[PDB]
Every structure is written in structure tokens, then in C-alpha cells.
Design a protein around this ligand. Sequence first.
Ligand SMILES: [Zn+2]
Ligand SMILES: [Zn+2]
Ligand SMILES: [Zn+2]
Lengths: 50, 76, 159, 55, 195, 290, 317, 303
Amino acid sequence: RKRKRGVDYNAEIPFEKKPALGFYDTSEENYQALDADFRKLRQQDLDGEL
Amino acid sequence: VHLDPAVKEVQYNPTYETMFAPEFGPENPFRTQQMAAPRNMLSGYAEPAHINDFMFEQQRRTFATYGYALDPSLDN
Amino acid sequence: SWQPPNVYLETSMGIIVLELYWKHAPKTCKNFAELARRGYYNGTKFHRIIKDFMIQGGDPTGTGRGGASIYGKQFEDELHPDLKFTGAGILAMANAGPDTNGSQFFVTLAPTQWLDGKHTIFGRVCQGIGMVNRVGMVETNSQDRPVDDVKIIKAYPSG
Amino acid sequence: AKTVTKQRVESHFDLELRAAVMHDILDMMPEGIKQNKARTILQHLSEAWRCWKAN
Amino acid sequence: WIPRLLEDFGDGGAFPEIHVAQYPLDMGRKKKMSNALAIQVDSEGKIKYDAIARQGQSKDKVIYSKYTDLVPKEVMNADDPDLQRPDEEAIKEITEKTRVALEKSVSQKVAAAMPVRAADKLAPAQYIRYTPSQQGVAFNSGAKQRVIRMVEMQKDPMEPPRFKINKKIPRGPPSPPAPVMHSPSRKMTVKEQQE
Amino acid sequence: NWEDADFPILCQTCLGENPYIRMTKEKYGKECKICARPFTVFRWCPGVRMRFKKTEVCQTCSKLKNVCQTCLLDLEYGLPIQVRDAGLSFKDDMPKSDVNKEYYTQNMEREISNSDGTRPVGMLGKATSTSDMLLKLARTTPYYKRNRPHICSFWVKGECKRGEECPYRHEKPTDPDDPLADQNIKDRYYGINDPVADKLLKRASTMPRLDPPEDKTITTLYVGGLGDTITETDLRNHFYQFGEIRTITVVQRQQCAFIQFATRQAAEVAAEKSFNKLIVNGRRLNVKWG
Amino acid sequence: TMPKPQWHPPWKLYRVISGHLGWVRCIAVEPGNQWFVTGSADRTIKIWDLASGKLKLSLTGHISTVRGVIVSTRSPYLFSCGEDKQVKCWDLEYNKVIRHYHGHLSAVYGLDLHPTIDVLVTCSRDSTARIWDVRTKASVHTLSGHTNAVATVRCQAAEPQIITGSHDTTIRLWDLVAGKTRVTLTNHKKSVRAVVLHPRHYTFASGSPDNIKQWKFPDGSFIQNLSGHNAIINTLTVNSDGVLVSGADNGTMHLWDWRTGYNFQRVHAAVQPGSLDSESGIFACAFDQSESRLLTAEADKTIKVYREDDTATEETH
Amino acid sequence: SLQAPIMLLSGHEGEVYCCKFHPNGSTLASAGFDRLILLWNVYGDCDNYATLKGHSGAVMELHYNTDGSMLFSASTDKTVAVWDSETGERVKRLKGHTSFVNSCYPARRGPQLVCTGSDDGTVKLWDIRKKAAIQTFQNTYQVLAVTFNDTSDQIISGGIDNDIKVWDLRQNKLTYTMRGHADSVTGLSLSSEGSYLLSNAMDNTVRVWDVRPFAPKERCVKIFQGNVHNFEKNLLRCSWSPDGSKIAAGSADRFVYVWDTTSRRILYKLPGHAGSINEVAFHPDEPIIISASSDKRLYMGEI
Ligand SMILES: [Zn+2]
Ligand SMILES: [Zn+2]
Ligand SMILES: [Zn+2]
């Protein structure tokens, strides 16, 4: 791969701004990721019906 | 007992009792060796000296030649 | 040579009432009660406020090095073998070293071992721990100095 | 910062007129208007100038 | 004479004689690592909700965040000493500080316009006293300070610029948004919205 | 932007064993090994048989991560950054990909140059909470084998024609079949797969440490090395910190003191505070379970 | 009736100067009341005799519309700016351009001279102000932080030395030494296209289509709010007798008290003969140094000159 | 009082070894390594009016007469310069020493006499009219500080032999030896009465010695501590207040030391010098202090 930018997208968060924090503790809670299911999944299935 | 603990650059002449009285209370335990030291930029206090060139380089070569020199610290 | 009960502070944030122990240390109690009586604290501030440690107060210069007493600038401590620094509210006497006490108190916020290792327990607060907590939640800076003024307005040697 | 020399003059005039109209329609609309519709008014300005040249 | 709870504490104040670990409100020993910026209160006013407005600002910055900044002041009767331009000599002092501060930046800009005319000279070899803040001595050799002689490295006249400067990156975030302080907002009708 | 600040931010094992230093200042000499923007390079000689060390990173890239500009170790402890972030949290997440790195560097440079110029801008609040295992393997006295001239590569081919005059060492380089040999600059700086820090963490994990209360609700503490010179009146004065203290059985014949607390949480907290740290009356007090 | 305002006499037109071939976008008066400048959309700066209303000189050289013109009080100079992106300095001794100030990216909308340092401060459509050294033609600072075009600028010698309103509805009070913002005043709902400084009382006002607001200088405290003149206002100017003038794009112009903010006169002037009813509009106004004439620069390519009515009180609310 | 307290004075170019207040107290002379003598105002705006050249060495010691007429400079090119207080001319240059002249002092109220000490071991007496040395006292060692009594009958001399020596002019013999300093004496000052004499020494003890016809024979009157001497080996000078009530001494830890003469208590420990201090001096009328240090600058503390 020969390019300056472009590999910066999957490697990390592109021009990352952390959310400004305050008055409520937001360190314990976290989100549950997406179920892969790589035996039914289609490129059409992620983007949805146009 | 009369002046601010740290502002800097006093416009009048203070006394020895009005500048070098100790700070009261207990020291806070919420600071480290670096955070409790009187530092100026992240690793200590750096101030311009005006030592004579010959005496400076004398003690420098004295340490570099044998292994000892006089102390340039100003109180210690 | 009399022994009043609780001392009435009237700060900017509210009214703290101080229950001062006359058995364990009567000499600091007579000093502090006399200074509250004369009008020494009317207009002085809580110069040093640390989060969850204590609130140091009482300085006509408002610096943390000034102050004097009725005895004159110093007197010995009352390091009692019963009084121990545990929990918020405990009123105390500020120090400079061994047995040097001026006119600076501090209400403690947290259980501390080094304090009753080397400090004098004056007394405690009885009425007003919420105002103590609101004073503890005030913005500070590098050397633990408030940006605004957290000053005491009046003081009464009641009881 | 490129200078407006001789081959940029008409393009820069039309670049600045359009910005002036943008400012005036942002300030002319009252308080609760949907703040779209700048492009359409600029198209009408273009059409009014072509009808001016066309008499 | 029984602690045991936060109830027996009437209006608080832990007794310093019980020799237990009582504490009036909940000043817990293991107050967990909370990233919540602490709720701070002003002298006799409200909870400072200003702290979520001045995130990236400093403590001297004057931002406006309350309703009491939108209230009109009085007519301020006459030639009042409240609304007065500071002082003529104070203005001259501000002018002097400002012109001396500006001329230095001017000289640093203009130095490019003639980079080499009488090409430069550099030997103010200076001294600085430095306190390591590391003491515990095995470090200097046993000392508390150290003196350093700084000479500035002598620049080659015949040497081109060293590094690529043309590298180009997008604009960073602007300083934290100011509260907008508008009026209540005039109500809009269907008729005028359509017209 | 350029860096241009006077007098670098240095430790004591690189600043030398002489209190009298002559250093040179080059205004925009090198580019940073991390930031890749040019900074002010300071060049000094620590001692007599040293190497003329110089600063490798910006003032800014040392203010981000509280390190020395040439050994890239913590100013306070003298340890790699992976060890210190292991004994802390890791919430910085400095970007490594190109445009993100220069963008983050620009924004943090504006952040630092919109502030005082004294504190480790993000590491400060987490730098309050400290004294983990890193203090029990912090280096006590300076390792002056760092400031030491590299292996003479002409002496490796047995062709060093300078001989006795060459200022480079005539001694063995390390076998490259070693994990302790690769060591990139950015690997040492971001705290990622640093083998020195790996070995320090492997040592600090096998450091002697607390065991849990194997049986339920037992708060009993088995104190060996109690000593016959100390008093039990001072024991309660050290021990009322934790909570509702229960009975304290004392056996001064085996130098073993038995301790009971109210909850097992208080006994675990006491195990945390006490084990292999606590020295009272200048004499080590050993506490165990069972 | 909370205040009682000062009585100000009504103003009336007495002279309509004509001769520009474009909208007259700026105007300024010389320090000695001998003449006044106008700058216009026909790319000429015209020097007019103030007493007689006669065209003294016509200077050319801008490639696009002249947006601001100011006369230096310390140096014998004339500064101008245009939609040309250009900022010029005219030596009035020679009637020739001697210096151009280069670096703005788009059209320069305004300029003000610092009264004591020889510093020129300009605004542009590129959302920045700039700070120029007059003698070395160099950008000292680039006051950036607005998000839309920047409409106007005023300078002082006292604190905040630079004050600007812009088309992103905000006002920024700046530091000339550091080059960073000190106060942001967001009170206006539409674009601040005029700010004006008071000669004595250490306050300033600013105008926008919603309403006009007065303000104390150190930290922008709200003092008052002057409303009733609801159009896109282009300029504000103050008489030392406390007369605020607010002129707008519809050609209307309202005369106000500074202290109480009482609207005592509305002047909705008539257009030039050839002109169009939609072409009524004011872009600039100035008081003379005697503060008894009112020079307005109109969208019907004219200058109008007003003076106080000598027929006393017919007035008082 | 004059102007605003501080009045920092710059213009010097190297170290500033010495400084003296005018006998009326309206002007000032400063000198040091600069091979220059500067005459500045004490009042108004404290601005330079006279620069005095005429040396090929470092101007070690500076003094005045009691009139404010004759300016005496001891330089490090084995000569002493004699000038007029106004008009700035080289009036009398006197060359007799074979090594560096460390200090000079004029005998006051008597006929015009100057006594100097040098590194060759010599303490020499000088009449300004004679172009020749009057009396020469080989001690044996380097001599750093030299002053008279009020009677113009004794030479009080400090050297590196840890012993203050008092010479009689009539007997030409070693009259007094004063023991009590553990290291070299760098500066002597005789009081306004002549009763007491103040001494700095390298052992970091500032000593007061009573010079009287009748002695307690162990003249260890007052001892001051806090004064720091270091590797720089500077010649440190001390000074008396006009009423003898305050005592100033230069220090090598950049703190201006002023003691109270009766309680032996540190009155003032004024900061504000980057470099080590060489001489601190009191204004003769008013409590104003000129302090001179190696950071090339002068300070006017107003008490
Ligand atoms: Zn860097
Ligand atoms: Zn290092
Ligand atoms: Zn070799």
C-alpha cells in the first residue's frame, strides 16, 4: 500500500474528539458491540435497502 | 506573617519576619516528590546565575580531572 | 476564666456551630473563644481549602503565615492521648512545627493518621456539616487558594 | 493570497456580489424561517441579470 | 455517646474520642475513579453549572452563562465615576507596553525580508542555576543544585533550511462554544412562514 | 509549529554526575523522533568517558507523557512508560497513523500553549494516585552505563586502526537473538511491546503479594516478626483507620499477633496496606493468612 | 416614564452631493474639517470640500469596490480597503499610493486606525481580522475565531484595544498584545454589522437587524438595549452630545439619545431622481469635527448632509 | 524618600565589586570589573551624568572622603586613582605596589592619607602630595582588607592568615593580633564613632571587634551567622548604618543581609539579585540602601 492517508480509518478513530465530560460519572458504563453472524450476512444487509 | 506566600516581584521592601515566616497547617498528602518541590517547568526550578567564568570552569575541570568540587548550591 | 459551650460561626455559605471540648484541651478553647469574642474573625476568610482533607480558616492577613494569640504568637500544644482524627467535622488547631499555635483553625474532612500523629484536636462541629461540605466544594488553584471569597462574616462565643 | 489582477476581475466581482446577497438574505429573513433557500434566490438573481441583458 | 450510623450525628461532626472509623456524610475510603468533574459551588450562590461551559477555558476568562447577564442595567444617571475611561497616564502606560510588545514581533517578522545582510553574531554565553527536584542524593554527586553554562550553537552561514515546512494538516477544533444568550424568541405564524 | 523553549527537561542519570555542565543550544537542530517537527536540541557531556547525549524529543512530547527528553523514562521514577501506564490507566491513546498524529500534535500543542507550562497536562490527576509496584522496582541510584559510547564497529571487524585512541568501546555487543535487543523509539515511547518494560512487569508480577481469605469471612491476621520491643497501644493507633476493629490476640512468645476485623473487606484492605510495605518503629511487621 | 432624556434638536437635510457612479460605501472626515473622503463602488476615492460640497479630487487605483476609507490623525496619510482584497496607504502629500498591505484572502470590509501606536486593523470576508504595522507593512497578528464574514472593527488605546462585530452574530473583544479573544458577546440574533465607541463614557453600542445594544468595555456588560429601528442597519455613529445615529439598508435613519435611548427623530429620506424606490439605503455616516453636520453615504450614489434645526423645542415625547 | 522603592539601576557590563553613598547623600558611585566608574543620582530619576575611565584593571575598592570632594579608587593594575567628585579628572595616580591592590582606605579628619594592601604581602601608606610611599609594612601574606582608625594612628588590616592585624604608625610594629576567624578575612569597616569595626571572613562568620584604648583583651563582641561564602572566592564587604544601628554584609547566596546591631537579629534578607552580592551600603541621611552584585545591576531598597 502506497499512500499518505487512508489507512487511518480502520486503524483508529480518524480525527478523534473525546466527548467533553462532566457532572455525571461516565467511566463504568460501556456499550455492547454488534453480533457478527458471518454465515448469513450480506453487503446488502449492512447498508440496508436503498 | 504579613505577605502573600507566592505571587512574585514585590514592589516594596519586606522584612525578614514578613517574608520568611513558615506556612502553617499540615502539608497535603495529595502531591508527589515532583509536585511538592518548588519547580518551574516539569523537572525543577531553573533560574539564571551570574557566576564568574574562571571559577565555574575551575570547579568544572576540578571535578572532571579528579572527582570532587565545591558545592554551587546556595543553601543546602 | 469561664467555659462557654458551642461557638457560632456565620460564614458566607451558611452557619456552622462548633462544639468545643473543654475537658481535653481547655487552653486552646479559652484562646479561640476569646478571639471569637473580641471580634478577631469578623471578615477573615478560609484561606486554605483542600478537597476531602480539611478547610483551614482564620487569618487577618489571609495568607496562612500570619496570626497571633492572647498569649502572643505561640503557646504549647495539648496532644491528648484520647483525641484521634477520624471523620469529617473535627475542629483543630493549625501548626507550624512543634508547639507553635497562632489563631488558625481547620475543620477536618477525612480520617487522617499523620494529623493526630502531630496536631491538636480542638473540638468538632455540631450544627452545620452541610455548610462545611458546601465550603469543601469550592474551586481552588495551584496552592489551594479559593478563586472567590469563602469568608466568615461574624462569630459568637455562645452558650 | 493570490491577487486579483486582470483575468480574475469579472470572476471576483461575481464571487463578491453573490456573497453580499448571501449576507443580505441571511439578515433579511425573520426569526423563524427555515434558513434554507439561499441557492434558489441566487438562481433568481442570475435569471434577473440574464433578463436584464436580454431586455 | 453512640455513633454507629449517620443518624446519631444530628447535624454532623464526627466525634474525635470514640476511636472507631465514623464519618458523618459519605466520605468513603474507596471513592471509585469517577471521571465526573466535581460539583463546585460559589461563595453564597448556586451550583456552578458554569463549569460545563468553561471546559477548555482558564479561570480568568469571562464567559456569560446565566439569565442575570441578560437583564438591562439602570439609566446610570449622569457623568458618573463608574463609567469612565481609566486614566490618561494609565492609557499611556498601556500604550507604551503595547507598542514595545508589538515592535518585537515586527522585528521577528521583518528579519526574513533581509535574512543575510551583515550575517549574525552569537556569543552571550550565559549561566543558569537548576534544582533537579529529584533529591535524595545519589544524583548530582551529593548536591542539591547544578550550574549550567549555555552557549548557543554557532550557525553555519552557508547552510540551506533543513526541514520540510510545506506539510499541511486540517484545522483543529475551535475554542469551547460560548452560550448564545438570545431572547425568548418571537412566535412564528403559518401565514408568514408561507409568505 | 516549531518548538523553541529554553533549557530542556531532563532526568539525573543523563544530566551527569558532574554538577557543572557545559551544554550547547541549537535553535531548530533536529526533528523530533516522534512528533517529526523541529525542536531545540541541547547537547551536553555528562562526565569524562561519556557519549555527548542530546535531547531526542520535543518539550511538548515530554509534557504529554511526563518523560525525559533523551532516556524517555519517567521524570519521577525512572521507568519505561509501559510500566508506568501498567501501574496507572492508559486513557491518553495518542494516535500512531500519520495525519491523525500530526493533527493530535497540533491540537495538544495549542492546548499546552493555552495553559501554564508546568504540569503533565493529562497525566496530572492520574499522577496523583501512585505508589503501585513501580515504587518497589524504581531504580535507587543512577545507571551511568546508559551514558556510554557505542561499540566500535571497526573493532568488530578486527580492524580498529585507532586502537587506544578510539573513543568507542572495545567490548562485546549483545547477541541479537535476545528480546532485549530490538527496541524501537516509538515502541519505547507509546508504551507498546517494550521488552524492558515487559521484563519489569514480569518481575513486578512475581513480586510477593497478597493472598485472599481462602475460607469465608475469616478476618484473622497472623503477624510474624512482631518483635518484643514494640507495644500494643501503638498497634490500635495504627489500626483504627480501617473500621470497626474486633479483638486482637497477642502472643509475644512466637512473635505472632492475631487480628480480627468486622468485615472481610477490612481485612483485605489491611492486607493491601500492610503486606511487605509497613515498617513501624523502624522494624518490619510481617502479616500472613492462617 | 423611568428616565427623562436630554432634549436634542431635530436634524434636517440641506445638501445632496452627487457624482459617484457606484454605491457610496464609506465616508470619513479629515481632522481639520477642510474636506472629507468617500469611497464607492465605482472604484474611486473622492475628496470633497466639506464647506462648499465640491469635488476636490478623484483618486483611482482600486480594482474593485472600495469598502472602507480612513484618514490618519498622526501621519499625513489616507488608508483605504476594497473588495480588491487590497489595503492601500495613500500619501496625501503626493496623491499616490505608496504602500499596499497584502495578506487578506477575500474582500476587506472595514478598517480602523489605532489612535496611538501606528497600527492598522482590517476585517475581511475570510472570517479574520488582521493587525498591520504601518511602517513595515507586516501582519503582526491574525485575529481569527469568527465563523462567518467579519463586518466591522473599532480600535482604542484603553482596554479591549480591538473590538469587532461579524456576520456570525457574535462580537469578539480581543487582546492586541496576545492576539486572542477576551470576551465573546453572543447577544445578537442577526449579524452585527456596526459597532460604535463612545467618546467619553467608556461604553460602546452595536447594531444588528433585531435591535441595538449598549455595553461597558472591560468585560462587555449588558448595560442597555435600544429597540424600535428594525432593518439591516449598516452604521452607527455618536456625537459627543450623546446623539446616536442608526442608519439602515431601507434608507431609514433614526436619531437616538445615548444615555436613555430615546428615539427622537426618524428621517426616511427621498431618493435621487433617476434612482429606484428599492435603491434607498445608507452604507456610511460620519460626524464632522465640529459635530454639527451629518454626512451620509447613500445607496442612490449620493452624499447627504444634515444639520441641526435652529427652530427650537417643538418636541419632548 | 525618593521616587518609588526599588529603583533598580543598570548600565554596568561586568561584575560590580563596590559602591558608595555621597557624604551628603545626593549622588552615588559604582564600580567593578567594568574598568569604569559611574556617578549617578540618588534622587529624581537616578540617571547617569558622569563616566570615569582611567584604569587598566578591575576597580576593587571604592571610597570617599568626609566632604564629598575626592574620589579614591583602588584598581587591579597595582595603582590607585585620586579624582575630584565633580568635573571628572585624573588628579593623582599613585603607583607603588608590585601586585594587585586589594583595598584602599582614606584616613579621615587628619592630613590626607591613604592606606592600601596588596597581594605581595605589603601594606603601604600614601600621602597624596608626595608621589611616594610613606611607610611600608611587609606582613608576609596576601592582604585583602585595610582601614584606619579615626585617630589616623593605626592600620587595621585583614589578610588570608586568619588574623586581623593592627599596625601602629609611630612604633612601626605589630601592635594587635585578633584571632577568632577560621578562614580568610575579606572585608573590614570602621564605624562612624570609631568604637567598633565590622569584619567578614570566609568562615561565614561576621564579627564585631571593639577598637578602644582600654580592652577586655578578648574582643569577641558580636557574632553574626547566615552569611554564605562559596567557591567564587569573592572579596566580600560590610558596612555600618549612619547611626551604627544597622549592619549590612554582602553574601554569595544572592540575599541582602542586614542585621540589628543590638539584638544580633537579621532585620532584612532582601532578594532580587540573580548573581552573588559584593557590597551593600546605607544612605547617610535616610534609610536607603544601594546593593551591588555580580549580576551587573544595582538596587535601591527604601526602608
Ligand atoms: Zn516531539
Ligand atoms: Zn534521560
Ligand atoms: Zn575503536
